[model samples]
Target: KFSAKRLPSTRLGTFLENRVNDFLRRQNHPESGEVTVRVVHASDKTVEVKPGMKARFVDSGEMAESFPYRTKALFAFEEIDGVDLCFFGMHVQEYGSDCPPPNQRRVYISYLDSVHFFRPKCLRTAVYHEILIGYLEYVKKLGYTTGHIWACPPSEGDDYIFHCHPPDQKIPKPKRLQEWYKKMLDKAVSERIVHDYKDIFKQATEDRLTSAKELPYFEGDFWPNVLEESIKELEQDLSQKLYATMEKHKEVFFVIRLIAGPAANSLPPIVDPDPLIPCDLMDGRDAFLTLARDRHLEFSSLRRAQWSTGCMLVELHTQ
Candidate 1:
């Protein structure tokens, strides 16, 4: 139950007067010597134009909020002759709480919507089109690109900006590495093999695995040198497949080079440690597959029937 009040403005009032005169002429109404459209608020939701004429409210609706949250506003408009004048204001309150008294809260008019007909329609359309085209060209000039990009969820906080790298670029035989790890774990469960291949792969990779500091081997001393040659072969095969795939689709594949760290922190640029190691080349596909499979396994295990119900209860209270 809100109504709009008129604000005094010489330019706006004069503009409305010109539109009213044009409407009268177009409708064949007897020309008044001169006319003025004044802003007025009346009790009956209608404005009297002269002795026998009145303007009525034509439409109204709730306006959307600019933010991703619940909010409320009041809006109303009138069609005087053929021109529409609209007014609106907003109010925000805590969910499920009563609105505070006037002295305890604040409110003000947010917008004024009016129309001018004397402005040429073609001129307005051309100006709008030029502005839009200019903005799009400016955005392109700034080198903006769009695609299916990933970023850490905002709720995870700003301290860690997690990034997903090309799996092969970071690890060797990603898929085989994953399958090998899973097979080893499964073997342990079936009592068919011991936790021996972990050390064997670690040693054969010349501690590339160690540089990433992944777990299980972080605390153990058991090294398996027996699988060294096998692991090296897998790494080589995976690397070749990765490079071949990239070369085959070079036209469509654009690599984004990013440094992995906190948002604001900068690290010294890494110079290639050895010329023998290829730059811009990713590691084996198997390595990425392995990492993904391990993550999936870990996530699936957490949601397994035995553990999920208890976890839900804990999250409901803690979260």
Candidate 2:
């Protein structure tokens, strides 16, 4: 299954392969041939990831006439000058609204998965640097202004590298991978590739993410008033969605990693910008803090004992 025959042979694969190869060439890399990209999964709205690729204003299920987003997931494989280098995947979302003024034409990108195969320690950092920065440029053209990366390192035998499935060998810890992303975001800022970067540590810090009010445990008739009993519970619930605690490192590593917006200085965002949500509704003091728990304590405590379940889910899908 790890053979080249297993790689995606669809038009989506060719599109990403060519796109990454072109990016490599423009970045002056020595070898840009035989690059491959696999479609892990995609949406019907993004149907063209297979046959024809282009954006379309698709209808929304939540509201009539309001257009929902579409996404294409691509796992890119690159080789450096005949040497196999790395595999990384990104989830690109075509996000916006039905109204005209700019919000209707933006993109959001996330580095959902990646793995380093190159053995040379020296080339590791340089290789990933090219990939990250070059990919940033790649998405810039697609009109993406916001990037959400969470820096949770993987434990041993945990999810690290990928080729559609866990590798045959024991996977090494991904602490270094987490370290690299945090540092890369910093360097990008110093290079003026992003306007500002924030450390979004829990619910208090991470305002961009909408509250998980939809989750049953919070508002369900089962657990009553658990939200107020421990406000941290809500954050913990939120944290499990985006990141995990790396026990080996003894670090939380829960920050949202970075909030990369338009590069350098710009009065208004270009192309598409962050969507407008009613600020009053999100203003820190609403449904999030007040909600309608001790056997409930048993419910949540058992959850913490089994916290890795949530973290495993993160690895299962978004990693």
Candidate 3:
């Protein structure tokens, strides 16, 4: 259903072309020609490329409106030999209040929100890798050192710019996405592309939890000094509970930092690593266990045959 078309360029096209070409060169891909891109941004405007090059726009309108700090919401196709073989979409944002610190370098965070390929032609190759690395290198050139992702799987209601396959085609499972990210991050780490941490998820989780805000306590009749220490405890406890609830509700979050360069290290460290417990790897079982411990059901301890029989009967009737 997804096909390629030609349109009318500037510096942006040149930048993307060079990046993908370099990626292709490193991989020694069979397709010697440079891959052209037809990108659509959050403004609903198609990115202009060199003359005769393809350009198309597929709207995921909600994404455009929903992103608060979105710097770019791009949907692009990589065409080779007259076929648009790969389509990918990403959301990039300029986050944090203090983004451009004294160094005057801008910080950008990106998410690879969607990707699909022409299964018949694009499978069993490094085309996806090419697109991803190309995009990363492009962004890095523009100046972005960190990336974030909400690892929640897309639901049927979620809209994409386009789906490569028919409506009946199966969507990717959450487990597959996790495995892919792990393998990709491992490769990046092995090659020194990412930061010091071997497991990015662990680093991200620790960073998020450690950065939790403390509760305000005023030593006055309005808020007594006796409640100050207890307020801190409450804050810590509630924050952990909230994080656990997020995990339980499939709102897993991840962050990764990319090394800017040797001399011009522009991007600041986003994640401070802790001991690797690998939260995403275990699917947040530890959080669930903690949640289970904290929020125990009243009747869970009951071992009586009468309770069991009554519960089973209720469950059966409901089913």
Model 2 clashing-pair count: 2
Preferred candidate (lDDT higher): 1 or 3 = 3
> In model 3, how large is the Cα lDDT of residue 123?
42
TM-score of each: 0.13, 0.44, 0.50
Put down candidate 2 lDDT per residue, 8-75, tens digits, no spaces: 35454554456555655565633333455655444423211110001111132221222245455555
Model 1 steric clash total:
11
* Best-to-worst lDDT order: 2, 3, 1
What would the per-residue lDDT of candidate 1 be over residues 1-319, giving only the tens digit for each residue? 1211232223323344445445445544332222333222111111111111111111211211111111222122233333332211112111111211110111111111112221332232222222222222222222211100111122221111012221222232334434433443344334321212222232324434321111111000111111223234554643333334334433221111111124213333222111121211112123322443444312122123113223312322232
Segments of candidate 1 deviating more than 4 angstroms: 1-236, 257-319
lDDT (C-alpha, whole model) for all candidates:
0.23, 0.38, 0.37
lDDT for predicted candidate 1 compared with the true structure: 0.23
Query: Which segments of model 2 are wrong by more than 4 Å?
Result: 1-41, 44-67, 79-86, 92-94, 97-111, 119-121, 160-178, 202-319
Write model 3 residue lDDT over 1-319, tens digit each, in one string. Answer: 2232232222444555565557667756564434554332322111111111111111322111111122443334444444443344454444322322211222232334333333234442355555555555454444455544444465663433322223443456777666666666566567665553223335436555432222111111111222233344564643454444445533234445654447345445332121111222112123223332354311122122123223322322332
Q: How far is candidate 1 from the true structure (C-alpha RMSD, Å)?
A: 32.4
List the pairs of residues colliding in candidate 3: 7-53, 9-49
Clashes of 3: 2
Q: Is candidate 1 or candidate 2 better by TM-score?
A: 2
